[PDB]
């Protein structure tokens, strides 16, 4: 759910 980690 972040920019760096899309799945996060």
Cα maximum dimension of the chain:
9
Look-up of token digits 């899309």: 6
Residues in contact with 7: Cβ distance below 8 Å, sequence separation at least 6, in sequence order? 1
Number of residues assigned to the chain: 8
Other C-beta atoms within 10 Å of 6: how many? Answer: 7
Method in brief: NMR
The alpha-carbon radius of gyration of the chain (Å, integer) is: 4
DSSP conformational letter for 3:
S
What the block records as the tokens of 8 is: 């996060």
Q: How many CB atoms neighbour CB 2 within 10 A?
A: 7
């Amino acid at each position: 759910g972040t920019v760096a980690v899309q799945f996060l």
